[PDB]
Design a protein around this nucleic acid. Sequence first.
RNA 1: GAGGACCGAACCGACUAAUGUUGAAAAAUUAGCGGAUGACUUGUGGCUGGGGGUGAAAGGCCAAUCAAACCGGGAGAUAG
RNA 2: CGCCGGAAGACCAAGGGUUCCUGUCCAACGUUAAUCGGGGCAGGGUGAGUCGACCCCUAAGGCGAGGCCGAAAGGCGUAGUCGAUGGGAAACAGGUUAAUAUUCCUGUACUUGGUGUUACUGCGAAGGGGGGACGGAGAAGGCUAUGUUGGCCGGGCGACGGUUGUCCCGGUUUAAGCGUGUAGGCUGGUUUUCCAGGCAAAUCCGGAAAAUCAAGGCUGAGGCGUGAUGACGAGGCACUACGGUGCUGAAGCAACAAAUGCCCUGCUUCCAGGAAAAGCCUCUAAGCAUCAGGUAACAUCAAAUCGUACCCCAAACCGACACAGGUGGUCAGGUAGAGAAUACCAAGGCGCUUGAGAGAACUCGGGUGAAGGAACUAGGCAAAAUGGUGCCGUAACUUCGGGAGAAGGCACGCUGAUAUGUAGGUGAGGUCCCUCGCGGAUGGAGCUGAAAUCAGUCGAAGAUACCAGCUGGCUGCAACUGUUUAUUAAAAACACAGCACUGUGCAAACACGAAAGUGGACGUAUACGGUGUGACGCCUGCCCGGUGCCGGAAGGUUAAUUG
RNA 3: UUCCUUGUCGGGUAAGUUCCGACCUGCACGAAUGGCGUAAUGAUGGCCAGGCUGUCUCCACCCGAGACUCAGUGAAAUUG
RNA 4: UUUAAUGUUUGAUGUUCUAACGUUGACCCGUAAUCCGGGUUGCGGACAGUGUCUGGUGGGUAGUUUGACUGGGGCGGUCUC
RNA 5: GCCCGUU
RNA 6: GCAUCCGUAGCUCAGCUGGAUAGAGUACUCGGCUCGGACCGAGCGGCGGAGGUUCGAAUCCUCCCGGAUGCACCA
Lengths: 46, 34, 271
Amino acid sequence: MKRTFQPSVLKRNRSHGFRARMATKNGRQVLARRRAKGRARLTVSK
Amino acid sequence: MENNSRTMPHIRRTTHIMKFAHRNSFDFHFFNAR
Amino acid sequence: AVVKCKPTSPGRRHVVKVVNPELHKGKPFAPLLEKNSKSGGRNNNGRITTRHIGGGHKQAYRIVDFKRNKDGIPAVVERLEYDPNRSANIALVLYKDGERRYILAPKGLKAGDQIQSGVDAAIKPGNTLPMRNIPVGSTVHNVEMKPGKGGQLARSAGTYVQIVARDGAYVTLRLRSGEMRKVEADCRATLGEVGNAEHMLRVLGKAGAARWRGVRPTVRGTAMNPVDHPHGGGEGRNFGKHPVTPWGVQTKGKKTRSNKRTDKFIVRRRS
RNA sequence: GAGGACCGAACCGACUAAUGUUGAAAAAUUAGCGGAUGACUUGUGGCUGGGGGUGAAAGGCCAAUCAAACCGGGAGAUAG
RNA sequence: CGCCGGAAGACCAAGGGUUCCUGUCCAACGUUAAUCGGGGCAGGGUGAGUCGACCCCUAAGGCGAGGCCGAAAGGCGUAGUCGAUGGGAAACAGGUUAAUAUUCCUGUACUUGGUGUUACUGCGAAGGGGGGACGGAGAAGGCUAUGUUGGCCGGGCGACGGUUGUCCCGGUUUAAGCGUGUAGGCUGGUUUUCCAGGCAAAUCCGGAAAAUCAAGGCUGAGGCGUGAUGACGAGGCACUACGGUGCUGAAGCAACAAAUGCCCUGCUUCCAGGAAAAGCCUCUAAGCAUCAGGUAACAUCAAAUCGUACCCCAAACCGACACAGGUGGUCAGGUAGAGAAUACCAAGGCGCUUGAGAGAACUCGGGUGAAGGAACUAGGCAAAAUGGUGCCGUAACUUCGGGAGAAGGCACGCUGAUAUGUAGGUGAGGUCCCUCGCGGAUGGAGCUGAAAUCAGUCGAAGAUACCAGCUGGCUGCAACUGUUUAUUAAAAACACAGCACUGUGCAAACACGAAAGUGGACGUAUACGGUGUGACGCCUGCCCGGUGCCGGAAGGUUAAUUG
RNA sequence: UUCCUUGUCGGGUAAGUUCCGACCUGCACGAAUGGCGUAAUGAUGGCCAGGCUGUCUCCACCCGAGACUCAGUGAAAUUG
RNA sequence: UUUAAUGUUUGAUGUUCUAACGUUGACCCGUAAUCCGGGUUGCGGACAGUGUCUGGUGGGUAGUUUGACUGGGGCGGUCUC
RNA sequence: GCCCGUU
RNA sequence: GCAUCCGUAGCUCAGCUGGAUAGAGUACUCGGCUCGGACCGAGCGGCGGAGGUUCGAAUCCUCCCGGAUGCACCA
Ligand SMILES: NCCC[C@H](N)C(=O)O
Ligand SMILES: [K+]
Ligand SMILES: [K+]
Ligand SMILES: [K+]
Ligand SMILES: [K+]
Ligand SMILES: [K+]
Ligand SMILES: [K+]
Ligand SMILES: [K+]
Ligand SMILES: [K+]
Ligand SMILES: [K+]
Ligand SMILES: [K+]
Ligand SMILES: [K+]
Ligand SMILES: [K+]
Ligand SMILES: [K+]
Ligand SMILES: [K+]
Ligand SMILES: [K+]
Ligand SMILES: [K+]
Ligand SMILES: [K+]
Ligand SMILES: [K+]
Ligand SMILES: [K+]
Ligand SMILES: [K+]
Ligand SMILES: [K+]
Ligand SMILES: [K+]
Ligand SMILES: [K+]
Ligand SMILES: [K+]
Ligand SMILES: [K+]
Ligand SMILES: [K+]
Ligand SMILES: [K+]
Ligand SMILES: [K+]
Ligand SMILES: [K+]
Ligand SMILES: [K+]
Ligand SMILES: [K+]
Ligand SMILES: [K+]
Ligand SMILES: [Mg+2]
Ligand SMILES: [Mg+2]
Ligand SMILES: [Mg+2]
Ligand SMILES: [Mg+2]
Ligand SMILES: [Mg+2]
Ligand SMILES: [Mg+2]
Ligand SMILES: [Mg+2]
Ligand SMILES: [Mg+2]
Ligand SMILES: [Mg+2]
Ligand SMILES: [Mg+2]
Ligand SMILES: [Mg+2]
Ligand SMILES: [Mg+2]
Ligand SMILES: [Mg+2]
Ligand SMILES: [Mg+2]
Ligand SMILES: [Mg+2]
Ligand SMILES: [Mg+2]
Ligand SMILES: [Mg+2]
Ligand SMILES: [Mg+2]
Ligand SMILES: [Mg+2]
Ligand SMILES: [Mg+2]
Ligand SMILES: [Mg+2]
Ligand SMILES: [Mg+2]
Ligand SMILES: [Mg+2]
Ligand SMILES: [Mg+2]
Ligand SMILES: [Mg+2]
Ligand SMILES: [Mg+2]
Ligand SMILES: [Mg+2]
Ligand SMILES: [Mg+2]
Ligand SMILES: [Mg+2]
Ligand SMILES: [Mg+2]
Ligand SMILES: [Mg+2]
Ligand SMILES: [Mg+2]
Ligand SMILES: [Mg+2]
Ligand SMILES: [Mg+2]
Ligand SMILES: [Mg+2]
Ligand SMILES: [Mg+2]
Ligand SMILES: [Mg+2]
Ligand SMILES: [Mg+2]
Ligand SMILES: [Mg+2]
Ligand SMILES: [Mg+2]
Ligand SMILES: [Mg+2]
Ligand SMILES: [Mg+2]
Ligand SMILES: [Mg+2]
Ligand SMILES: [Mg+2]
Ligand SMILES: [Mg+2]
Ligand SMILES: [Mg+2]
Ligand SMILES: [Mg+2]
Ligand SMILES: [Mg+2]
Ligand SMILES: [Mg+2]
Ligand SMILES: [Mg+2]
Ligand SMILES: [Mg+2]
Ligand SMILES: [Mg+2]
Ligand SMILES: [Mg+2]
Ligand SMILES: [Mg+2]
Ligand SMILES: [Mg+2]
Ligand SMILES: [Mg+2]
Ligand SMILES: [Mg+2]
Ligand SMILES: [Mg+2]
Ligand SMILES: [Mg+2]
Ligand SMILES: [Mg+2]
Ligand SMILES: [Mg+2]
Ligand SMILES: [Mg+2]
Ligand SMILES: [Mg+2]
Ligand SMILES: [Mg+2]
Ligand SMILES: [Mg+2]
Ligand SMILES: [Mg+2]
Ligand SMILES: [Mg+2]
Ligand SMILES: [Mg+2]
Ligand SMILES: [Mg+2]
Ligand SMILES: [Mg+2]
Ligand SMILES: [Mg+2]
Ligand SMILES: [Mg+2]
Ligand SMILES: [Mg+2]
Ligand SMILES: [Mg+2]
Ligand SMILES: [Mg+2]
Ligand SMILES: [Mg+2]
Ligand SMILES: [Mg+2]
Ligand SMILES: [Mg+2]
Ligand SMILES: [Mg+2]
Ligand SMILES: [Mg+2]
Ligand SMILES: [Mg+2]
Ligand SMILES: [Mg+2]
Ligand SMILES: [Mg+2]
Ligand SMILES: [Mg+2]
Ligand SMILES: [Mg+2]
Ligand SMILES: [Mg+2]
Ligand SMILES: [Mg+2]
């Protein structure tokens, strides 16, 4: 049957992409936490 | 949720398997000690 | 003309429709139209702030002249049109200089009739003039409350306002609800009643007719759980409570007017 | 040539029975069944955020989780 | 040999990302073996002015200089600026690779800009106006895609009786563009004068007046001509690594039937009254005036960048799997049929990645059954049965619509005749007229073709398969169509049209918001909110002591404050 | 909605705790948290009849897919 | 106890006024702008509205409580002398 | 003001 | 089965004056008005049983009987 993950690249980048994270202060603290942990992928981008 | 299982990483909610009252074949007439 | 449908189906058995053949079968006047998109009852926070709103037919807004301040110039009535935005019908008028405007259509007004606003206009239905030059006892509609602001009272189909007294800089109006109210005498009004007075004689007949107007279904509070409404709960049909709103305020009797700056304009409240 | 009209495929749904129940499947299959121009159905995008939303109201649904989601923290809460 | 064929065929979007093609390998992966593979390794493969993105323009909505508001963080919003699922210039046919093609090649086209020359000329916007520009349902006419038959052309003379014919098989294809302007649709045309309107102006739009003409203009499928002395072409001939390659090539017409596609963003009708902005056309202001600019012809130049392989109802996407699940759009052949149902087929694609035997109980999915026919069981659960078209016929009750397909019954194949194929549909030639052409009248060849009657005939059975209502009687509840516990409950529950009470005079009540503000509503008491009841018919009685709400103000009691 | 209760009487059956009609002794109906009716409608609750049948008396045989044997691959719950 | 007179002075109610304050009335400008601000004017007007303090109401929302004994709990009874 | 009945 | 409240004149109901004294309406009886009602005037008529406290009980105890009300739940 129909499952929960239905992929769409435009809706992916608009919801959790890099400019979406940089637009609010709470999204910028997500990127600071992921840089502090040292992650190889910061956002869900291309 | 069971979020770090190494034996079964594909599944997080598993009590539909072994808990008898959560299986799809559970009937409430099994609970007749009432 | 009030038409009863024949019961060829259970959704048609009770339908009563109002049919006016004098309306304009055709497209509306395009330079007086504007886009009017729907809300769903939601404000700029995105929350529902008025319930039971949603869906319905797409509608274009018609710019209706509520001010009637193009004075001294006469206007002929071209045709009567349908307006989906109000219960009243509207009329397209043509002024002598070539200007076209929508006005509210008053009772007994046909195509070819001659209207004129202004302080020197005549006392006949359709004309707009300040209430200091309307005789006491006349039947008016589209009444201003502030001078120059535009008509705000008695706009709905079949409604009117009686001028009961003029003493001073004020006139006393008998409103449609039965309220006596003081409005100042330099405010404008239009002579006559509003047309389409059998608008209240129609019967929708079925549930889908109310959904065509953008009215969503009402759930009774006594049909809910106590977490949802004060009336909720019960093992069977139980009420036991004093009737309240979804936010706990007593309905069925309790007055909610709280406005201390307009109380000096209200002579008598409705009863 | 009207209709929340009629019969009936696509399409939407889920009333009955059998199978399956370490399944082919964490809810299906087979045979029948209901709606099928409408209060219908569907694609793409958008809005509403947790004592909050949304609800033709079943405590239903809010990412296989809901009489208060999930993640991190107070936190080694407390446990006659 | 079997299966699908409104897909299990073909082409895409979304999503995936090399799974595509060629060579090579078989450890692991593949529910078995594997020489094979969507597996390992290596190499190759995606070619655009016209397709799409980007781009210009906006919807919902987002962000938002100043601004308004908020302990801080921030919230809302103006001017703006983003945002497609919508609007906006232009290409077709044929050929070719192992793998790309409307992109390469061949043939024939089209669009928008820049620059230059010549000829002529009031050009100019952040402004005005037009246009773009829009619903549901229904009906009819004209067409095409496509199909069938005939004619034509090429081939055949049959493994077993017959088959030189009223015989059999195959082919009979051709685009954009350019030219013509038809079926159909809409609308009167032209000139002059004037004006409280279109934020100023206007020769444009709107309004008024007068004269004159009986016609004009706009839109538009298809057809026809050209494109095309070409291309393609059944086959034949010549080589070959037997995969394929090279050359030549006949006919290439007519009739009938016919769409859910086109004319049609039309027409008719209804109420629930049906986006926006730019490109486009036009008007003028500031302004410039032998300038600049505008219009036409000709020449020349430019049209960048990114995507393009492959899968896409699936073994490549979402489901942990090569998982009986889920997934939007486009194309729509034949015979029978009302049909996109169903049965059998075409083009095309497949036999679902363990097999071989045996023929016990029992389980699953089916077939048939003596006599009886619900005796079974909580309960006719499940099965069995009914089933089509035409005609005859049809009760109580009723809100006069219904009930009703009530119930029940009769006919049904094939052959011949009526009639060498009828009624109807289509309509060539010939003739006549003019408006001389895509015209009208007459005319009927040819093609297509029901339904009925009479007579005969075969079978147990003619709606023969697939497909395809069981019917009737009494009663509870809910008026009805709808909605709901995704995964044990579809209902008598919820909703509903209708009814009533109550609040609400507009800066409305009320709701979301420390606020600003927003919804209610660009609505105004025939309106909006809340509550209860629930179509319709007949009705809805008595009680205000209690609790609540509304009204009252005399008296009693009574806060901060004052002292 | 009625505990006593399978109340009593009538109908239907050879036989009816259910059904239909009536009576009133309403444990404990009742008028818009509506009363009583009601044509049409319902995958709604109850009851009866005709047709039909492996539902049953009471099972028998047959066609396929497993079960069984051979070859290859090769699990699970549980367990002092 | 009871009143009037002169001199001096608050509270109440009422009536006008405008100048604080309101304006989701009109017009002009910033300005290519239904925001906002400034200006002119009209209507309200010391009212309304807001801050501090204060009485009432307040399951709208929150934090909690709701005993033990007991031939099982509940119900009943009991709890000290 | 009220003032029933009579096998 | 448990709990709570009631038994008073022929009938329906007061009286707990905290223990020292029983009443009302209606019925019935007698007399009058007119034949009978209605009406008027007078009268008559007794603490559910059985023990106990008490100087003394309808009243307070204990048991019994009768009549009502509520409860008898989770399995
Ligand atoms: N939202 C879906 C997450 C699926 C995950 N593997 C699970 O078993 O929950
Ligand atoms: K409702
Ligand atoms: K309930
Ligand atoms: K129809
Ligand atoms: K939609
Ligand atoms: K929460
Ligand atoms: K989740
Ligand atoms: K191998
Ligand atoms: K496998
Ligand atoms: K698009
Ligand atoms: K322009
Ligand atoms: K326009
Ligand atoms: K004009
Ligand atoms: K390609
Ligand atoms: K065997
Ligand atoms: K049928
Ligand atoms: K009813
Ligand atoms: K249902
Ligand atoms: K429900
Ligand atoms: K109302
Ligand atoms: K609005
Ligand atoms: K009362
Ligand atoms: K009261
Ligand atoms: K009262
Ligand atoms: K009852
Ligand atoms: K009998
Ligand atoms: K009987
Ligand atoms: K049903
Ligand atoms: K029924
Ligand atoms: K002012
Ligand atoms: K105040
Ligand atoms: K004990
Ligand atoms: K015990
Ligand atoms: Mg509402
Ligand atoms: Mg309602
Ligand atoms: Mg409920
Ligand atoms: Mg509550
Ligand atoms: Mg109840
Ligand atoms: Mg229908
Ligand atoms: Mg559903
Ligand atoms: Mg089902
Ligand atoms: Mg099915
Ligand atoms: Mg049906
Ligand atoms: Mg149907
Ligand atoms: Mg169906
Ligand atoms: Mg609809
Ligand atoms: Mg979507
Ligand atoms: Mg519940
Ligand atoms: Mg999850
Ligand atoms: Mg869930
Ligand atoms: Mg909680
Ligand atoms: Mg701590
Ligand atoms: Mg711990
Ligand atoms: Mg087949
Ligand atoms: Mg690879
Ligand atoms: Mg390959
Ligand atoms: Mg292997
Ligand atoms: Mg392959
Ligand atoms: Mg490979
Ligand atoms: Mg590889
Ligand atoms: Mg483009
Ligand atoms: Mg903003
Ligand atoms: Mg701070
Ligand atoms: Mg833009
Ligand atoms: Mg390819
Ligand atoms: Mg324009
Ligand atoms: Mg064509
Ligand atoms: Mg030849
Ligand atoms: Mg020949
Ligand atoms: Mg032979
Ligand atoms: Mg614009
Ligand atoms: Mg996949
Ligand atoms: Mg998968
Ligand atoms: Mg996974
Ligand atoms: Mg997953
Ligand atoms: Mg497989
Ligand atoms: Mg699959
Ligand atoms: Mg689908
Ligand atoms: Mg089919
Ligand atoms: Mg084939
Ligand atoms: Mg067998
Ligand atoms: Mg038999
Ligand atoms: Mg036989
Ligand atoms: Mg037999
Ligand atoms: Mg039986
Ligand atoms: Mg039996
Ligand atoms: Mg059945
Ligand atoms: Mg009958
Ligand atoms: Mg009839
Ligand atoms: Mg009839
Ligand atoms: Mg019939
Ligand atoms: Mg015959
Ligand atoms: Mg019953
Ligand atoms: Mg219903
Ligand atoms: Mg239904
Ligand atoms: Mg459930
Ligand atoms: Mg369920
Ligand atoms: Mg569930
Ligand atoms: Mg079920
Ligand atoms: Mg169900
Ligand atoms: Mg309301
Ligand atoms: Mg109800
Ligand atoms: Mg009061
Ligand atoms: Mg009986
Ligand atoms: Mg009965
Ligand atoms: Mg009731
Ligand atoms: Mg009741
Ligand atoms: Mg009542
Ligand atoms: Mg009531
Ligand atoms: Mg009834
Ligand atoms: Mg075996
Ligand atoms: Mg083996
Ligand atoms: Mg004042
Ligand atoms: Mg609480
Ligand atoms: Mg605590
Ligand atoms: Mg205890
Ligand atoms: Mg006990
Ligand atoms: Mg008598
Ligand atoms: Mg006598
Ligand atoms: Mg005694």
